[PDB]
RNA sequence: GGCCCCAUCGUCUAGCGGUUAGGACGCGGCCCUCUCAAGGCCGAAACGGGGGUUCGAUUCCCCCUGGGGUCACCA
């Protein structure tokens, strides 16, 4: 069959650039009624920051890809975390060492430094030591790193599923370090063992991996393992074009949820980076990506990350593919962490849907709409002005909405329009300075629905402080 | 700099030899209207350059230019 992974590497906030590749790892398998892999790299103790595991984990939950096999769902092929396969990645060091495709090299990291000062790069000094010496001196304890010995001069062929094949010298591919001095390997070593053990047959990774390619295919020859299938997905970046990075970018999925984009919003925005529907609408579901997925609608220039654009399609999901309720419920968070609080659901949900065409994130309802949950909303000085330039009319017009019975939008227009009329005034000279009364703005949903939201006694409260 | 990838509006993109080069974000105008939005309508905005192949190139081939990536005991 079909499967796939992502290697994500345990090293700071969860990445987009992640999201972006899982999601394609994720539909590739669904597509094809595959599997989808998590292996966690965590093989550089030094990078290593604690509690980046979990993080990454629920951001592609939160994102809305599931899958099958990983670190917390269990699966055949375990451990899915490297750190616990360590003597797997010694084992088959020793056989490619056994087997002439490697070689130790006792190298301090300072003597790497001077070689590659002079001679830039390393230059495989290290292959002239007899075999019977190296292994002599590894007894012996001598630090040192295992290194593939690639086959000179030579070349070698690589194939990218998308961009054809890309043949490689040998003199191009340096000897890496397989297996590092403190026993833990590199991402050349572990990607290609796990990948086999695990039955990897779609290698998904982004564009940064094509030129380490030859290095893994070499890798696959010297186990003498059938090579998977590579498919270098474009790099996500910067307004500036340069590869998304944590300055030029918010390249944090935390920052997302934080800001209250909504994770349907921001799969939907990744698909459409680098992927397009042949009837070229761009609102879709995750289901209906995984249907309509090929590699043939993929283009592979470096798409830019627009935050204006996902904030539209996230105000779109807010308002045409959310339910009022769903939207009711995702924005309680935020009105918590804005220290308001709503009277009941039916209060919300009525909020809600006054406000749903004039909020694009979540963090942006509590922010415009404020005044509908505490007394403690600010004032602007347009709304002071058109405030105080209209309390005659709203003097004489207390009187009237303190004796109306009905309190429904249809009866308040009705009275408010007459009261207008009556008083040979356009409806926008009483009705804008009464919004300013009851929101402290001059932006705001419908003045009818406003007014009668609150009900009678909340809303003649708050008018009358504005005339005290 | 060496190697490798990429090339349609500012951005995301549709073209797969013959199109008025389409859509979306953003931007400007208009409509709707009690404000602000939402929504509808209209509009400005692209094939980097030079050779070719071909009856004909944005579509195919080559050079140039441009942009990006990569050159570790990180991935
Ligand atoms: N900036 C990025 N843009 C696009 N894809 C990325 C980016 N960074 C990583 N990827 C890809 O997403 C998957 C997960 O990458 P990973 O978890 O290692 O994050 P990372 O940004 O590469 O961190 P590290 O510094 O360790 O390389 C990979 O298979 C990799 O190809
Ligand atoms: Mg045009």
């Given at each position: 069959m079909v499967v796939t992974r992502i290697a994500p590497s345990?090293?700071?906030?969860?990445?987009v650039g992640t999201a972006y590749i899982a999601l394609f790892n994720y539909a590739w398998a669904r597509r094809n009624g595959g599997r989808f892999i998590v292996r966690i790299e965590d093989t550089d103790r030094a990078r290593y920051v604690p509690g980046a595991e979990e993080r990454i984990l629920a951001a592609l939950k939160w994102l809305g890809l599931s899958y099958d096999e990983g670190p917390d769902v269990?699966?055949?092929?375990?451990?899915?975390?490297?750190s616990e396969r360590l003597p797997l990645y010694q084992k088959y060091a020793e056989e490619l060492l056994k087997r002439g495709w490697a070689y130790r090299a006792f190298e301090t990291p300072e003597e790497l430094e001077q070689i590659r000062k002079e001679?830039?790069?390393?230059?495989?000094?290290?292959?002239?030591?007899?075999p019977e010496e190296a292994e002599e001196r590894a007894r012996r304890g001598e630090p040192h790193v295992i290194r593939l010995k690639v086959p000179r001069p030579g070349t070698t062929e690589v194939k990218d599923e998308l961009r054809g094949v890309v043949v490689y010298d040998?003199?191009?591919?340096?000897?890496?370090?397989?297996?590092?001095?403190?026993?833990y390997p590199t991402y050349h070593l572990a990607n290609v063992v796990d990948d086999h053990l695990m039955g990897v047959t779609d290698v998904i990774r982004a564009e940064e991996w094509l030129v380490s390619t030859p290095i893994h295919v070499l890798l696959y020859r010297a186990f003498g393992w059938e090579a998977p299938r590579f498919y270098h997905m474009p790099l996500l970046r910067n307004p500036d074009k340069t590869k998304i990075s944590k300055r030029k970018s918010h390249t944090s999925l935390d920052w997302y949820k934080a800001e209250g984009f909504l994770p349907e919003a921001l799969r939907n925005y990744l698909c459409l980076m680098g992927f397009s529907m042949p009837d070229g609408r761009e609102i879709f579901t995750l289901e209906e990506f995984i249907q309509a997925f090929?590699?043939?609608?993929?283009?592979?220039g470096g798409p830019v990350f627009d935050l204006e654009k996902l904030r539209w399609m996230n105000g779109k999901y807010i308002r045409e593919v959310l339910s009022l309720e769903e939207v009711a419920e995702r924005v309680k968070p935020f009105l918590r962490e804005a220290g308001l609080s709503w009277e009941s659901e039916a209060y919300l949900r009525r909020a809600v849907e006054l406000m749903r065409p004039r909020?694009?994130?979540?963090?942006?309802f509590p922010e415009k709409a404020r005044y509908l949950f505490t007394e403690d909303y600010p004032v602007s000085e347009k709304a002071q002005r058109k405030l105080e330039e209209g309390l005659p009319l709203l003097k004489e017009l207390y009187p009237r909405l303190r004796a109306q019975?009905?309190?429904?939008e249809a009866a308040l227009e009705a009275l408010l329009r007459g009261f207008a009329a009556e008083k040979g005034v356009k409806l926008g000279q009483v009705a804008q300075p009464l919004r300013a009364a009851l929101?402290?703005?001059?932006?705001?949903?419908?003045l009818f629905e406003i007014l009668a939201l609150l009900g009678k006694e909340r809303a003649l409260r708050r008018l009358e402080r504005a005339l005290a």
């Open positions: 345990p090293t700071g906030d969860p990445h269990g699966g055949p092929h375990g451990p899915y975390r490297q001679k830039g790069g390393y230059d495989g000094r290290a292959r002239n030591i007899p040998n003199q191009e591919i340096p000897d890496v370090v397989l297996l590092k001095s403190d026993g090929t590699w043939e609608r993929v283009s592979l909020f694009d994130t979540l963090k942006e019975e009905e309190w429904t929101t402290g703005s001059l932006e705001t949903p419908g």
